[PDB]
Every structure is written in C-alpha cells, then in structure tokens.
C-alpha cells in the first residue's frame, strides 16, 4: 500500500480497478441548494505528485 501517483485515465482506471465491481454511488435525492461544497478530495490527491495510497483509493472509492 503506497501513495501511487494516478492521473487522467490511469487515475480512473486505478479507481475502477481498486473498486472493481464496487463502482461509486448514484442515488437521486432531491437536492438542496449549494450542496456542491467539499473540495480537495482524495481523488485530487492521487493525481498529485505525492499521490494517494491504495487504502486512500478505497477511502475515496466505494
């Protein structure tokens, strides 16, 4: 478990490979205004030169 630097398709592929069948979450609720809040998530961290660990990949992914 190391902080792999994953970017572009490789970042998504890493998320796709780590999650596999897990994927991500798609429930439609009614949406409150300005619920977009939340920045600098682990997905951004993986692309950075520091990268994100496979555990961090699991944390941001399913």
């Amino acid at each position: 478990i190391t902080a792999e630097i994953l970017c572009s398709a490789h970042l998504v592929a890493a998320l796709q490979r780590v999650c596999g069948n897990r994927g991500v979450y798609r429930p439609p609720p009614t949406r409150r205004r300005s619920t977009r809040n939340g920045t600098t998530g682990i997905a951004t961290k993986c692309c950075t030169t520091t990268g994100c660990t496979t555990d961090d990949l699991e944390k941001y992914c399913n």
């Binding site: 572009s8 979450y25 798609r26 205004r33 600098t40």
Partner: protein
C-alpha cells in the same frame, strides 16, 4: 414529468433506466463510468449542466437523448454547460435536436473516436463560443465528416453543417426562434415550437415559465425557483426551509441577510456582520492542516473548541487569515500545540472574545505548548482580547519572549489567575534574542543606487560597555519581513566625535526597490550581568529614488497599409519606477565578465598590502497603457525612424528614458 434536483447515474449500465419518464431534468445530469440500446425521447430540457465521462459502448448521444433541445445551464460545472470527457467508443454528438445552450461553455476532450466536431456551428447554439474547449478528440483529418442542407461560415471556412450522418443541423431563417419549417416562434419562446408564436406551444421557455406560459417575469404571487420556472409561496414552504427574497426562492438568505424571526420565510437585512455562527458536531475542531481550517471559512462565532496543531504547511499566515480571520468569539478554549509553522497568531485578527464553556483539565482556556518558531502572539498593542474564564499555560516556546505573554494578560484580564508554573522562563524564551532597547533612526537620504541612513547615538546602560553597531539590510518585495531568516550585514563603529551620529552608506542598490533596513547594537559588557539588555531598531522600509527607466525592449514594426505603421515592443528591463506611459516618435527619412572580475580581486590585494596605518521634423505621441500603437497619415513607401521612450511616474522630474529606435517603410501606394 420533472426529475431532480440532480441525477447521478454511474457504473451499472441498467441504472440509466431512471430516465424512462423524465421529460425535464431539474438540475444536473451525470452519466459516468458506464460499461445495449436505451432510448429516451421524453427528455428535452436540462436546467443545469450535462456531464459524460468514460461511458463504454455508447457510440452517439442521439441513441439516448434524441429530443434534447435546451441545456439551460442554470448552474455550471466549472463554467461548462456540457462536458464530454474520456468517452470511449463515442463517434459523434448525436444531439441533432439541440438548439440553445443558455449560459455555459462546452468542454469536449479526450475522445479518440469522436467525429463531427467542426460540422457543428456552435455559434448559433450557444453564445460564449470563445470560451469553449475542444481538444484531444479524434482528428477531423482522420474521420470522414460527411453529410447525407444548409451551410455558413465556420471560422474562416464555409462548409456544410450536420449533426450526424442522417440528420442535419437545423437553423432558423433570417426573418426571425422558429418551428420545424420556416415559421418564427414567440419572442418568449426558445428552441422549437409545437405551434408558431404561442406561449402554450413552446418546447422550452426563455426567461421563466409558469402554468404552461413563457412569462418574462414571474406573476406577482410567484417567485423565482431555480432559473427557469416560478413557484408560489406554499411550494417553497414545503422545500427543506427555503427563503423568499428579492422575488426569488433560494435555499439560504444571501450574504448580508438573515432570517426574520417568526416569519422565517423572508430575509431581514442585518447591517453589521450577521451572526455567522459555525456549529460543528465534533467537540474540539483540530486544525492540523490548511485543508482542515477550510470549514471555518467566513465564520464569525465558533461554537466549540479550537486545537491548532500545524507542523508542516504552505503559505499559512495568509491562508488561515482567509478562513479564520473573521472569527471573533470562541465559546470554548483554544489550544496551540506543536504548531511549529506558526511564527505569529495574527491570522486570528477579529478574535476578541474567548469564553471558556469547556476548559482543558486544570481550567485552562488558552494553552500553548511546544511551538519552536512562535516568535510573537497576535497580542500587539492594537488588538483587543478578553478571556472570560480559564487560565493560561505557556511552555516550551523558545522563540516567544516571556514579556510578550505578560502583556497578554493585561488585555486578557487574567493577571493573577494563573499559577507559578503556568508561565516558565526556562522553556519559554529559551533562545530569545529580544528584551532590548529601541534604536531610533534619525534621517534617510535616497538616490538611484545609494542610501544614507543615520540613527541616534546610543549610550550603553553601563559606562564600561564597549558599543558597536550592525546594519541589517535586504531587498524586500513587500513588508512581511521577519528578523530571523537574506540579511546583508555591515559593521559600522561609533564615530569618535560625539557631535556626529552613527550612519552607514549603502552602495550598489537597484533603482526603485524597497529595502528593509534595521540596526542592532553590539554591547560588549565588561561586567557580565545576566540582565542582558542590548539595543534593536525598528524595521524601516526604504525604496530607492526612481532612476531614469531602461530603453524599451524588442521594438518591432510593420506596415499593414499605406500611411500606416504598426509598432510593438516590450517593457524595459529595469523600469526603475511605476510605468506610466510610452512616448513614441516618428521622423520622415529622406529618399536616397571574469576579466574585469579577475581584475577586481587582484586590485584589492594591492591596496590590502601597500598601505599601513600608523600605530525632417519629429512627430511625438504618448501611448497610455499598451505596448503597441499604430501611426496614421504617412507618405506611402517612405522610410521612417521610430524612436520609442519609456517613462514612469517620476519621469516628470528625472526625465523620460532613452530611445530604442527602429526603421520601417510604409506600404507602396
């Protein structure tokens, strides 16, 4: 059938079935990471943006949404109303019914099989075509963009316009918002028309929509909801609540407004800083990074406890000050532990009240510990502070002068509240270089490269102390300069005559540059009294007197027409002053290191060893802002000398710079 307020379909291909009944999507739409045939002719309008990302198997957008006509883009995804990114197997944008995109731009990227990009005239579908981003797709040279109709000018070319290989790009006549075939729609209409120029026969309403009518402004008893329709007062009383303000129904009152009591459906204008309470479920908010402090952005009162533990970080003083600079009242306690990056707590400016609802063990409201670089608190004689209840504990803070925290409890009001061990000089102020008197500067004289600065004579506290001075100066772009870091140091002795005061002349300085200068005294005490005093001066910022600016760089000239000459250039190398304007002149022309460096060091050895002490007229115009200008009214095919000068704010007294000149000939008549 309205669907919203946001659709996010991903992973499962079959989850796309949630669009079987939706004709309008209220909010955004997300189709990501999708890995058969699904058709949704019901959907026509999307209020917000549309996002597609890594959908395998899909070849064209017309397979899913053939009837999609308007993407209003009421809220944008990074200023984009439609994002098609990393879409594999995708061949074309099959949205042949798309007519109007109201707000945002488009970003189509990384689609190695996507065709028909240049075949779509986006200038008639959206407005901000300049801010679009279509990079990284399949190359049109390797596609085969073929139509089975009309055409217009795309960029500098004129060619046919088609969405797919069966459907063209539909357009309205120049007489009109039109129907299927040549009949203009209603002015309040948008896209297509079930019937011409009728309010109740519009696929999508521009402005707003209510009761089947495209209305410009909402009816009197209705309010703006989202950005396309109007709802009544009882509707937003059921959304979970929302406020009614400025004829609009938003989730929360805008900045500078607060909810009215009892009548909590309207916002009352609060004049001062409205009580922006930030309430977090965790008892003690730990700020261990700049990212963690982000949640405290814009807070005025903090219902909780603050635990600052910042070891590493970025430019922090300006960052926390963005988030926590507005915090004024802390209900609980504040603990600054292991915050080695902090040299000062100045990022907590408006913090003027610390209550103490919860206090650390031993009844402590302010608790600092192990801050190796904390030179000073935010307690300077300008800020106010009040700790209502609790004590203060200071330990293992070596760069913090102990006198600074004694000054704190005066404003704090807890002078005799702490114990004897709460403040300990042993681990606090350990390596301190403070506790000194004040050296006062006397006069400063500035030239383009020299600075003369003198300070008052300093009598040492003891008669026997031998006194000397040290001048610390360095180039500082701005004022946030600390004494511990850079500094150029020169030792000047006290002059023998007591009538002249000590000074120093600095030589070799950049013109128009702000320098940070401060003087420290060298008190060699013969009687080693551990009551060390020393003397230190204030940080004085001095900028060189502006010199004459440099010549403009890279003067290039051309002639696009007779009697006209276009000239462009670069700013000078050494502005030596705030650039104000350029002065250009054109005159008609009649028809036909180591070496000097090595000498330096050798030189010094000589003196260091010889001497021994006894024991056509010019036309002139000023370009105000840009580095480009066009000259008019010239003799065709005649040579011209182009002199260009560069002035600054003080060029009124110093005089403008020299001329970097060029020669250019106009176009033949």
């Amino acid at each position: 059938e309205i669907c919203g307020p946001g659709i996010d379909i991903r992973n499962d291909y079959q989850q796309l079935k949630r669009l079987e009944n939706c004709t309008v999507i209220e909010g955004y739409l997300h189709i990501l990471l999708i890995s058969r045939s699904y058709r949704f002719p019901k959907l026509t309008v999307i209020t917000e943006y549309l996002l597609l990302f890594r959908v395998a198997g899909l070849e064209s957008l017309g397979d899913l949404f053939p009837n999609l006509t308007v993407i209003r883009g009421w809220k944008l995804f990074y200023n984009y109303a439609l994002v098609i990114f990393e879409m594999t197997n995708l061949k074309d944008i099959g949205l042949y019914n798309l007519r109007n995109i109201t707000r945002g731009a488009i970003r189509i990227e990384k689609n190695a099989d996507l065709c028909y990009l240049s075949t779509v005239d986006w200038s008639l579908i959206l407005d901000a075509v300049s801010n679009n981003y279509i990079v990284g797709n399949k190359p049109p040279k390797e596609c085969g963009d073929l139509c089975p109709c009309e055409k217009t000018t795309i960029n500098n070319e004129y060619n046919y316009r088609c969405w797919t290989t069966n459907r063209c790009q539909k357009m309205c006549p120049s007489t009109c918002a039109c129907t299927e075939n040549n009949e203009c729609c209603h002015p309040e209409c948008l896209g297509s028309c079930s019937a011409p120029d009728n309010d109740t026969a519009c696929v999508a309403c521009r402005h707003y929509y209510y009761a089947g009518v495209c209305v410009p402004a909402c009816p009197p008893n209705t309010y703006r909801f989202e950005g396309w329709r109007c709802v009544d007062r009882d509707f937003c009383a059921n959304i979970l609540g929302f406020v009614i303000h400025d004829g609009e129904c938003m989730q929360e009152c805008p900045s500078g407004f607060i909810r009215n009591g009892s009548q909590s459906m309207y916002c009352i204008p609060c004049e001062g800083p409205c009580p922006k309470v930030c309430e977090e479920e965790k008892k003690t908010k730990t700020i261990d990074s700049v990212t963690s402090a982000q949640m405290l952005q814009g807070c005025t009162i903090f219902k909780g406890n603050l635990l600052i533990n910042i070891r590493r970080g970025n430019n922090i003083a300006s960052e926390l000050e963005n988030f926590m600079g507005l915090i004024e009242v802390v209900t609980g306690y504040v603990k600054i532990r292991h915050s080695h990056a902090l040299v000062s707590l100045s990022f907590l400016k408006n913090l003027r009240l610390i209550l103490g609802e919860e206090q650390l063990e031993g009844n402590y409201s302010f608790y600092v510990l192990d801050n190796q670089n904390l030179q000073q608190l935010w307690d300077w004689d300008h800020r106010n502070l009040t700790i209502k209840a609790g004590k203060m504990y200071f330990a293992f803070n070596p760069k913090l002068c102990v006198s600074e925290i004694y000054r704190m409890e005066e404003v704090t009001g807890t002078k005799g509240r702490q114990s004897k061990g709460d403040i300990n000089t042993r681990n606090n102020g350990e390596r301190a270089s403070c506790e000194s008197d004040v050296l006062h500067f006397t006069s400063t004289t500035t030239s383009k490269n020299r600075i003369i600065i003198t300070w008052h004579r300093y009598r040492p506290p003891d008669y026997r102390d031998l006194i000397s001075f040290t001048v610390y100066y360095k180039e500082a772009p701005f004022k946030n300069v600390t004494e511990y870091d850079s500094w150029n140091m020169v030792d000047v002795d006290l002059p023998p005559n007591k009538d002249v005061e000590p000074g120093i002349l600095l030589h070799g300085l950049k013109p128009w540059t702000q320098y940070a200068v401060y003087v420290k005294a060298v008190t060699l005490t013969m009687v080693e009294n551990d009551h060390i005093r020393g003397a230190k001066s204030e940080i004085l910022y001095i900028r060189t007197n502006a010199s004459v600016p440099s010549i403009p760089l890279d003067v290039l000239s051309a002639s696009n027409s007779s009697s006209q000459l276009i000239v462009k250039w670069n700013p000078p190398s050494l502005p030596n002053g705030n650039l104000s304007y350029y002065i250009v002149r054109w005159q008609r022309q009649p028809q036909d290191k180591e070496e000097a460096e090595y000498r330096k060091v050798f030189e010094n050895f000589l003196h260091n060893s010889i001497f021994v002490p006894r024991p056509y007229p010019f036309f002139e115009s000023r370009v105000d802002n840009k580095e480009r200008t066009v000259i008019s009214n010239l003799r065709p095919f005649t040579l011209y000398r182009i002199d260009i000068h560069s002035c600054n704010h003080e060029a009124e007294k110093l005089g403008c710079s020299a001329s970097n000149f060029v020669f250019a000939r106009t176009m033949p008549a």
